[model samples]
Target: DDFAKLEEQFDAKLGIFALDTGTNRTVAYRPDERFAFASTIKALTVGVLLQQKSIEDLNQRITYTRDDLVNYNPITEKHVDTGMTLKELADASLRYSDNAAQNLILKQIGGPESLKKELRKIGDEVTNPERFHPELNEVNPGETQDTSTARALVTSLRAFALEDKLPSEKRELLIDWMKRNTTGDALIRAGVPDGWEVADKTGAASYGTRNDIAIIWPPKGDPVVLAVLSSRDKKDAKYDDKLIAEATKVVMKALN
Candidate 1:
């Protein structure tokens, strides 16, 4: 009944997965269906890069020429005549969803295929790991956008949450950046109660594809991993946000 209500409220194809660390139990709804990954792919990109290079490498400078600029980018607009460190690029990519910064990171890492290979090495084989090339975002005949199932994303987040494989400093930096992430506060975080900690990455595509993957730390309980993906044939950003928020509200109530 609760899921039915969620479906009614969202009015889109939805996928969700929630895991309770206390009991090691998982919850899911259409967890296998495909949805666009959008900027959320940046998380996987950074993860791969961190595995290959040290945090000190993150300070390497990356200059952005006019050829590097992209539409809908805050970092490029502000730093058109300047450059940024890899760490600064990562901060902008995760916190502000800066397209230019993401592209640069992808370039430094050898490209989307390289990121996908690294993800596979980490056992996250389902995500499409395509680089955020804005030119490709334009509609094309018989072309599909980058995609991943809810379960696939949850698996990646679960590994990051455990932090058994990655060094403490690298993990801390990523989670900290995610905590500082200001985008999508109106999405999944909208339903989060005051004082709870949420570290998440949100994805938005022009065709009304909205997704969020979060590690929610409740003050009174063990942290939970939640991922929600919603897609529609029509493009409606507002509807996507409302759907994500409502789904998050329902999931939090169930967990409580």
Candidate 2:
């Protein structure tokens, strides 16, 4: 009822999966279908870096020129002259979805395939990523790369964000960044009650793809990990933040 109604009203496809870790309960819709992950992949890439490097290692300074800048880089663009540390770049990508910062981190840390291998290592066997920056947006019919099933997203979240797959410090850092994410105010966070706390990552692309994956903490109960992906068929279609928010609302109500 949650996603099906959302799809009908918005005239877009939807994929959703939410798990209540405390209750071991789940609500799902189109959970296995492929959806473009968009910038949501940034969180996992940061996770990979966390696993591969130490707190001190992340301090390694990185510098870039204008050629490295991509679209929508609110953080990295200003730092192009001043340079940045690996930790700062990771923060920029997670908090701002700074494309150039992410691209630079990806290349420096062995590129997309390296992250794919790290995903497999962390039990995210169902997600696949094949390209960089703007090019990763091309998720064709097969949806071979830069795509993840709703179920797969929850798996990754459980592995890295909830479980101790990452060190305690790294896990806390990831949670901090998600909690402070700047791009998702109108998505899942908006749908949740005003008092509840939400930590999430948001993704957007050319095909009207707007996605949000979150760890929602209600005032009294346990946390819920959820992924909501919405996309229209038309390439020029505009993303609907309200649709994603409503989906979160529906999931919240049904969970109880």
Candidate 3:
């Protein structure tokens, strides 16, 4: 009933996955299809980088210049003349969805293939990313830019929560950074009740791709993991936030 309401309220193709970690229960809607990942790929970028380097390594300074600039980036907007630390860039990319900051991270890590290799190492067979720049909006002549399936995203989150691959400290840092993310407060987080908390990453593109990957923590229960993705007309994209919020609310209710 809840999902039917969502389909009626919006006309976009939607992909969704929700998991109850305690019992390994799940809900799925088009979970196998791929969609643009947008800035949510930044989380994967950070994850891959952390696998090879420490948080202390992220604190080191890096040079910046106008040539490195990209639109919609607060980091470049404020410090184009003087570069920021990798930590600062990571914060901007994760917390503020700063494109240039993320590009810099990509630059440091040697590009999309590095991240792709890292994802492959983790058993994620999905999520092919050909490029990392948002401004150029470039997809290779025959390939998609960055894409993933809801099932794959849910699998990644479950690994983060249950696997011993990443050190405990690095995993906690990833969650803490996500918790501080200031973007998309009105999307999935809006649905969370007072006692619960949400740590999430949001991704959107002007041509109408909206996505969120989240971990919902209740006051007294195991966490819930979810990913909601949509591709719609630009005008219709306005409804995505409300749709994700309502979907999250429904999932929370079912779990409780």
Candidate 4:
């Protein structure tokens, strides 16, 4: 299959899992291999919160200090003493990849392991997130912390979005946050059909890691759930957004 050709073209390993929800068919390439989850973990982090708490609990306040901040936290760093509500924290983490905000969420939910527990509880047995924000991005071959498989990614997203595992309103908010995500333009979003709509979350880390996971809705047909994860062999390898797009293109061609 051309799937492996993407690895050749980009000089990076890839794990792709796409599901045609309407037809109940899936396309896979190294679907069970582990890869860094990076910010994409925020998707299910919120899912866990929504499943455990009522919507109004989101109004509870969470205050953080300068020490709580992490690298690449654009949103929470600005709030500082002003703090943020649980709702704002989730928003910042999901849409902006605010590390501190995500940590606060993890704290509320009992850390990254809770996300893993929820995953296993919901039928995703292979995905495991094992660290705090920022540090979780450090990845190595065979390492498990803050990592997930392409198949696990797709299954986790499907549970929250299409399987009614979450309350309808909570699911709506989760999907809305993903759809409003400003970070995925050049990856999977760039490759889907013109009229199709996507609700997705993107992730990245060192070692050329870049990923996009989502539920993509066609113009006139049912939706598709897809996860594309990649990482190169060297630490200095630069991420290629086009490579992720190319992977999406191939998957869409055969499955859509």
Candidate 5:
């Protein structure tokens, strides 16, 4: 399989397998290994609010007057100048990796406990029991966070797509939202037959811990799911961005 070849090429230390509508299998790597989620956590927050329960008139037009907003992170800080709708905030979190939008969604979702309880109610893999939103890597301690192997994440994506397991219509709404997602720099979309609809998310932090999980739906039948995550040995010279790119390329080759 193409995936096996990639494992050899990247000199991969750890890996996780993938599956799709046609197959039910997980690749290598320990799915239990935690990886920095980065902005992907936003999907859980926003999707929950949008997909579950009857959305109240929370649809009120809210504006960002510079003071009413907080920068989400590097990517979302740039989005500060715009005032957005509840729907827009949710979309920005998925489609554009908008941090402020994400944080607002977090608030709208009613902090950590509320989100955690809701996810648990729906049967998601909420491993770590702590409730702090990982503010980023480093000095932060005792902050509970979670990770999903390619298969698990895709399963969530699939659930969201089919609306079979998420809280009510939230799954369908989340998938529709993910389809509008545009941050395209990860495993699933990097190497594919041109013109495939590759939906995925990427997470990056210090070191060589570059992670990507994607659901690849080629125009043809039988979609191929992929998750390529790598944490290079303690001493690899390639910087973070380049390392992920090389790793992703290697994974793509293997998939082909």
Candidate 6:
């Protein structure tokens, strides 16, 4: 694809790949490079929830509190979850990228402990929760927020796709929810070819960390999975949108 060939011209540290169940192909310099998951952890949180509830059960209602949030702002603080279904929380997380909705969903999905257990059960032993961000006191930085590798992420996506990581119906539910994610419009969306169906998640923060995990269905080829993580701007330690845009170009190139 023309997307990434130009990225090499920029000397960016590109990391990318295409994955199938039986094989994996790397197209960048460091597809394995790992970075902190600023918000991508929500993907796993969503998975764990599907496993805990029946596909239809997800529509059942629940409530939440401010302490349950990791980055809930005043807007969400005003509108309490007086009554919203688990399905609503998942929708909010994927569709709106709402932190409060995500935090509440994480709580219902067994929190950090249960998610860890689910992770191990799926053989993604290397992935674990880290403190959200030790330096940023403003963001609550959950006790178990952590980092993950591209492999671990794609592995989870593969499992989800195969309907083996979680129950059949629930897995489908999670996949459908992911399809609703509209954020990070510049990465996978920009990289994959036209008419391709992309199922993925994106996470970014002020710490110069950008992470994305995606499943791409090309128009004339089999589907592939991609996981990308990047860290730039060490001095200020914040996620640079432009840098991520540059990284997106690199990802689009490799995957395309």
Which stretch of 10 consecutive residues in model 4 shows the poorest summed lDDT? 111-120
Q: Provide TM-scores for the models.
A: 0.91, 0.97, 0.91, 0.96, 0.72, 0.79
Q: Where in model 2 is the C-alpha error above 4 Å?
A: none
lDDT of 6 by residue, 1-256 (tens): 4334433443233344446533455554455555566667777778777777777787787766766555543334545657567887777776566777776776666666677788888787756764332222222223224756677777776776654767777767777867667776676666555687777788765435666777766666666777766654343455433444455455555545
Give the C-alpha miss distance for residue 121 in model 1, angstroms: 0.2
> Which candidate model has the greater TM-score, 4 or 6?
4
As for TM-score, the candidate ahead, 2 or 3, is 2
Model 4: lDDT to the true structure: 0.88
Instruction: State each model's CA lDDT, in order.
Output: 0.78, 0.88, 0.78, 0.88, 0.55, 0.62
Off by over 4 Å in 1: 135-145, 235-238
* Candidate 6 accuracy as TM-score: 0.79
lDDT of 2 by residue, 1-256 (tens): 5577789999989889999999989988888888889999998888888888888898999989999997999999898888999999999999999999899889877999998988988778888878998988767656667899888987897678879889898899889999999999999999899989899999987679889999999898788999998778888789889999999999988897
By summed lDDT, the worst window of 10 consecutive residues in model 2 runs over 136-145
Against the true structure, candidate 3 has what lDDT? 0.78
| Local accuracy of candidate 4 as per-residue lDDT tens digits, 86-108 | 99998898888777888999999
> Which tens-of-lDDT digit does each residue in 1-256 have in candidate 1?
6666776776677889888888877778898877777777777677776777799988898888878878667876687677898999989888888888889889899888887777787888798766456843432222444677888888887675455546888888888888888897988889889799998888777557778888888887788888988776665444458778888888888776
